[PDB]
Design a protein around this nucleic acid. Structure first.
Lengths: 47, 56, 142, 150, 103, 37, 110, 117
RNA sequence: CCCGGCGAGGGGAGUGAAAAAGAACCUGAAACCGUGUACGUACAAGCAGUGGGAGCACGCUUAGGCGUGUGACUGCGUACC
RNA sequence: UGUAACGGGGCUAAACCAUGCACCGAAGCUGCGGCAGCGACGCUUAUGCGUUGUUGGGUAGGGGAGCGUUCUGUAAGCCUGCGAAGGUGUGCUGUGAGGCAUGCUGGAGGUAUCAGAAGUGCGAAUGCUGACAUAAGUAACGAUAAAGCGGGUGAAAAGCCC
C-alpha cells in the first residue's frame, strides 16, 4: 500500500512560484510592484 | 531608402506578374531542308530560305 | 428558427416614375432614398438591395425654400491643389440639374458598395419624357 | 564555466544588445542560472514519530492479515531451492521474513529470490513493512520488536 | 396552421410536426408537455389575443432530446493592463417536437 | 566559410571611432549634435 | 503512365528556373523541346536535359510512344544554399547564398 | 531533473494556430501574430454576442415599421396600439409574420387601430 | 540496362522487413518556398477580424432544408508589450 | 492644403419656445437557462438539498484552488512489433490550464493510481544559438590600357591554345 499513503489535509501547502504567467497571480514583477530599490535583485535596505 | 514593413508574398507575386517569359511563338520550317529554325535566321545545318549557306 | 433574409437573386423590384415639379429638394430626396434602400418593404434587409427603380423627371423644376436658390453652394475639389470649385444652386440648374437631385439622394444613401448599387437605380431626367416606356413605370405620386 | 571575463563587444555603438560576459545564463554555452550543488536530503524524524509510525504499520499489518507469526522459520541447507519450496508450501510469494536471530543459511537462501527479503528484528524500516505483501515474523522477532517499540 | 406560444424566456412560431429547440425544461426525454399560453393561431383565419393567451388554445409537444449546445469561448483581455481571462460555455437546450396545435 | 563569417562578424565589436557610426558607417552626426547644442 | 526525371542540386536559383518551367507546363513534349531549344536562358538547358531524360525513362523503363507524351507536372523545388562570403567595404562581409534547386519533370501520355 | 520543453510548447503553439485558420498572411502562419489575432477575435466575439441582440432587434423594428406603414400606421402607433390591446407578441415574431403572413399582420394592425382609437 | 559531357543528377533492376532506411542516410516539427484542386477576387478604400450573410463546390441525406471549404454584400471594430 | 464652426445630405422647420402623448435607446432592470463565492437556516452531522438571501469589472497587491512537464517509489506490476514514444489529422469532452478515443507516418519503448523532488510552462529582455524570409532576381561584377577575325580542342568557346 505505498501508493495509498497520503499526507494530512492542510500540511503540504503549494509554494509561490513567481514569474509564470498572468493567471497565476504573480507574473511579471512577481509580487514586487513597480520599479524602486525594493523591486531589484538584491534590493532592500538594511535593518 | 529602406522599407519600413516587410512586404508580403502577395505584393511579391504581384510584382513578378510581368516577369513571365514569352514562348517562341512558332518557329518556321525550311523550304529545302524541311527543318525548323527561328524566323529570319539560318538553320542548324546552315540553310536559309532553301539555299545552302555557311557549310562549316 | 432564423430571421428571414431577402435573397438578391429573388428580389422582385418595381419601376416608379416621379414628377419632381415644385417639390422641395430634401423632402423629395428623402422619400427617394427611402424607396431606393427598400425601407418601405417588409422584406428589407440591410445587406441586400431591395429597393425600387425610380425615374425622376422634371429635375430642373425642383424647388427650394428661402434664398437657397442663390445661396446654396455646391463645393467640390478637383484634386489639383487650389482646386476648390464652387457652384450655386441656380448655376447647377442651368448647367446640369440632374446633378442637383443626384447629389441630394446620393448623400442620403449609405456609403459603400451597396449604396452605390442603390444609386444606380435612380434615373433622373431634366425633361418630361424618358426612354423607359418598356419597363412600364407606374406613377408614384410623391 | 570555462571562458573569459572579456566583454564581447563594446558597451555602446554596435547595434547589438548589451552584453558583458560570454558565460551569461542567457547565452548558449553559458552557465546555469541557479546551478545546483551536491545536497543533503535527509529529514529529521523525531524518535517518537518513528516509533509511532512503526506501531501504526504493525497494527495495520495485524489488522489486514498481512502479518504471519511462526514459531520457527529456518532452512535445512543454504539452498534457494529449499526456501523456494518452503515458501511455496506456506502460500507466500512476496514476503518479508524477519527473524530474531539472523540465520546464515536463510540469508543465503533468500539472496537470489526477488520478492523475498530476510531481516533481523533490529533492522526493519517502514518502507519494507509497507512494501512487502506478507510479513513473517519469528516469535523471537516479535518479542524483540516489542522490546524495541516499548 | 401555425401558432405562436411563449416558452422559456422567449417566443416561438411553430407549425405542426416541427422540431423546436427551447431552453432546458425539467421533463423526461419521451414525455409530452403542453404549452397552455399560446399567443396566436393562424390557419386561414387568424385568432389572437385581446387579453393575452388565447382562451381555447394549447400546444401539445413531445420532448425529443435534452442536450448541451455548441461551445463558445469567452475572452476577456484588457490591453496593456496584465489581465486576460478565458472561459467556456455550453448552453443546455431541449428539442421538442410539436405533436399538435389545438385552437 | 563559417569560421570566416564568425570572425568577420566580430570585426567592429571593440572599436573607438566616433565620427563613424558603429565604427564604420559614415554620417553627419557631428554636425547634428554640434548644431543641437 | 507518369514517368519522372529530376535534377537534384541544380546550380540555378529556383526563381530563375521557374520562368522556364512555367513555359513548358502542359505542352506536348516535342513542342516543349522546340520551346526550350529557342529560349535563351541557362535554365532552359537544365530543364531540357531533365525533360529529355524523362522521355527516355518513359520509352525505356515504361511504355514507349514519345508522340503521345505530355509534360503533365513540372516543378522546381528549392535546394540547399551554399553559404559564401563577399568582402564588402570598410571591413564588413556578407553571406552570399549560392542557391540550388530541384527540377522535376513528370511526363505522361494520359 | 532537467525538463525540456519542446513537446508541450509545440502543443500550445499548435492549439493557437489551429484557432487561426483562414486568417490573412502571418495571422495564420506565424505564432506571434496568430496569438494576437486569436485574442482580438475572442474580444470581438464577446462584444458581438451582445451586438447581435441589438442588431436583430433593429432589423425587426425596421420590418414591422415597413409592413405597418404599408397598412397605414407607423411603428410607434402600432406598438402603442398592441400594448393597449394587451397583445404580448414580441417583435421577432411580428417581423416574421410581417414577412410570411400578410393577412395575420393585417389583422394585428386592425387590433392596434381598434384599441388605439 | 537507359538519359546524360566515359559527368552531376536521375529512372528502372537488385539487396533489404522497410531505400520518401541510399551514405546530403532513424524520427522528421515550424518558419520559408512550391505544384494541383474548390471558392473568392480587376468601381473599390483603413489592425484585415467579428456578428449577420447570399451564392458556389464537395459529402451526405429515405428531398428532412445538415456538415466541410470559400465568402459577394453588410453592422461594429485604430495590433501586442 | 479642401467645403471645412450642424458629423453629412438636406431642412423654412427636419430651428427655437411652451404643453402632451407615443416609440427608439445600454453589457442598466426584468424573463428564461447555467455556474461560482459568502451568510442564514431544518436535516443531512464528516455534507448535500427542498431551501433561502445576496454577491461575482478590476491594476499594484493579498488570499484560495487546480492543470500540465521531467525525474523517484508503487513497478520484475500494467500497456506495447496484433505496434510505444514522437509527428500529423479528425471526433468527443471539462469553467480553464487541459483530458480522452482514433486514421495516417513512425518504428521501440511508455506508464495508471497515490505519494515525492523540481534545471517545472516564454512573445517581448537593441535576449543567445541555428535556420529561413524581406528589400530583389534589385545594386554590383573592383581603374575608361581596347579589342577584331580565322583555325584547333571540346558536349559546349567573347575569355583556353595557335
Amino acid at each position: 500500500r505505498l501508493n495509498t499513503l497520503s499526507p494530512a489535509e492542510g500540511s503540504k501547502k503549494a509554494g509561490k512560484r513567481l514569474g509564470r504567467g498572468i493567471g497565476s497571480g504573480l507574473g511579471k514583477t512577481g509580487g514586487r510592484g513597480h520599479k524602486g530599490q525594493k523591486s531589484r535583485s538584491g534590493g532592500g535596505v538594511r535593518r | 531608402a529602406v522599407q519600413q514593413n516587410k512586404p508580403t508574398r502577395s505584393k511579391r507575386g504581384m510584382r513578378r506578374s510581368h516577369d513571365a517569359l514569352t514562348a517562341v511563338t512558332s518557329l518556321s520550317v525550311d523550304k529545302t531542308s524541311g527543318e525548323k529554325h527561328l524566323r529570319h535566321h539560318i538553320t542548324a545545318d546552315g540553310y536559309y530560305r532553301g539555299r545552302k549557306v555557311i557549310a562549316k | 428558427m432564423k430571421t428571414f433574409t431577402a435573397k438578391p437573386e429573388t428580389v422582385k423590384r418595381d419601376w416608379y416614375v416621379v414628377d419632381a415639379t415644385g417639390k422641395t429638394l430634401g423632402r423629395l430626396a428623402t422619400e427617394l432614398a427611402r424607396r431606393l434602400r427598400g425601407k418601405h418593404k417588409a422584406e428589407y434587409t440591410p445587406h441586400v438591395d431591395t429597393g425600387d427603380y425610380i425615374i425622376v423627371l422634371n429635375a430642373d423644376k425642383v424647388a427650394v425654400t428661402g434664398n437657397k436658390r442663390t445661396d446654396k453652394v455646391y463645393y467640390h475639389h478637383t484634386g489639383h491643389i487650389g482646386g476648390i470649385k464652387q457652384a450655386t444652386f441656380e448655376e447647377m440648374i442651368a448647367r446640369r440639374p440632374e446633378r442637383v437631385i443626384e447629389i441630394a439622394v446620393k448623400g442620403m444613401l449609405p456609403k459603400g458598395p451597396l449604396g452605390r448599387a442603390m444609386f444606380r437605380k435612380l434615373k433622373v431626367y431634366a425633361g418630361n419624357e424618358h426612354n423607359h416606356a418598356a419597363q412600364q413605370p407606374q406613377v408614384l405620386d410623391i | 564555466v570555462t571562458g573569459s571575463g572579456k566583454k564581447p563587444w563594446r558597451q555602446k555603438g554596435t547595434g547589438r544588445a548589451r552584453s558583458g560576459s560570454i558565460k551569461s545564463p542567457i547565452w548558449r554555452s553559458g552557465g546555469v542560472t541557479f546551478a545546483a550543488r551536491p545536497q543533503d536530503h535527509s529529514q529529521k524524524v523525531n524518535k517518537k514519530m518513528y516509533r509511532g509510525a512503526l506501531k501504526s504499520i504493525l497494527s495495520e499489518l495485524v489488522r489486514q492479515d498481512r502479518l504471519i507469526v511462526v514459531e520457527k522459520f529456518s532452512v535445512e541447507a543454504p539452498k534457494t531451492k529449499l526456501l523456494a519450496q518452503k515458501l511455496k508450501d506456506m502460500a507466500l510469494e512476496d514476503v518479508l521474513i524477519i527473524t530474531g536471530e539472523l540465520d546464515e543459511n536463510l540469508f543465503l537462501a533468500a539472496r537470489n529470490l526477488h520478492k523475498v527479503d530476510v531481516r533481523d528484528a533490529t533492522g526493519i524500516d517502514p518502507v519494507s513493512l509497507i512494501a512487502f505483501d506478507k510479513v513473517v515474523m519469528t516469535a523471537d522477532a516479535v518479542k524483540q520488536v516489542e522490546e524495541m517499540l516499548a | 396552421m401555425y401558432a405562436v406560444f411563449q416558452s422559456g424566456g422567449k417566443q416561438h412560431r411553430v407549425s405542426e410536426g416541427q422540431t423546436v429547440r427551447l431552453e432546458k425544461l425539467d421533463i423526461a426525454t419521451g414525455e409530452t408537455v403542453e404549452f397552455a399560453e399560446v399567443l396566436m393561431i393562424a390557419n386561414g383565419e387568424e385568432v389572437k389575443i385581446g387579453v393575452p393567451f388565447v382562451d381555447g388554445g394549447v400546444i401539445k409537444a413531445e420532448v425529443v432530446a435534452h442536450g448541451r449546445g455548441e461551445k463558445v469561448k469567452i475572452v476577456k483581455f484588457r490591453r496593456r493592463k496584465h489581465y486576460r481571462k478565458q472561459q467556456g460555455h455550453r448552453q443546455w437546450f431541449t428539442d421538442v417536437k410539436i405533436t399538435g396545435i389545438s385552437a | 566559410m563559417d569560421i570566416n563569417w564568425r570572425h568577420n562578424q566580430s570585426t567592429f565589436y571593440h572599436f573607438t571611432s566616433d565620427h563613424r557610426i558603429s565604427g564604420w558607417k559614415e554620417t553627419n552626426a557631428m554636425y547634428v549634435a554640434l548644431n543641437s547644442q | 503512365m507518369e514517368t519522372i526525371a529530376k535534377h537534384r542540386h541544380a546550380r540555378s536559383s529556383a526563381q530563375k528556373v521557374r520562368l522556364v518551367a512555367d513555359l513548358i507546363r502542359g505542352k506536348k513534349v516535342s513542342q516543349a523541346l522546340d520551346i526550350l531549344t529557342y529560349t535563351n536562358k541557362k535554365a532552359a538547358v537544365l530543364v531540357k536535359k531533365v525533360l529529355e531524360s524523362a522521355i527516355a525513362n518513359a520509352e525505356h523503363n515504361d511504355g514507349a510512344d514519345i508522340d503521345d507524351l505530355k509534360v503533365t507536372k513540372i516543378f522546381v523545388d528549392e535546394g540547399p544554399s551554399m553559404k559564401r562570403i563577399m568582402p564588402r567595404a570598410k571591413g564588413r562581409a556578407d553571406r552570399i547564398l549560392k542557391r540550388t534547386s530541384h527540377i522535376t519533370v513528370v511526363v505522361s501520355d494520359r | 531533473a532537467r525538463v525540456k520543453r519542446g513537446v508541450i510548447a509545440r502543443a500550445r503553439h499548435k492549439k493557437i494556430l489551429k484557432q487561426a485558420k483562414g486568417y490573412y498572411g502571418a495571422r495564420s502562419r506565424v505564432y506571434r501574430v496568430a496569438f494576437q489575432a486569436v485574442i482580438k477575435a475572442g474580444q470581438y466575439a464577446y462584444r458581438d454576442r451582445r451586438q447581435r441582440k441589438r442588431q436583430f432587434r433593429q432589423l425587426w423594428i425596421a420590418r414591422i415599421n415597413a409592413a405597418a406603414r404599408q397598412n397605414g400606421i407607423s411603428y410607434s402607433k402600432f406598438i402603442n396600439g398592441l400594448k393597449k390591446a394587451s397583445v404580448e407578441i414580441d417583435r421577432k415574431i411580428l417581423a416574421d409574420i410581417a414577412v410570411f403572413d400578410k393577412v395575420a399582420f393585417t389583422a394585428l394592425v386592425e387590433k392596434a387601430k381598434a384599441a388605439l382609437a
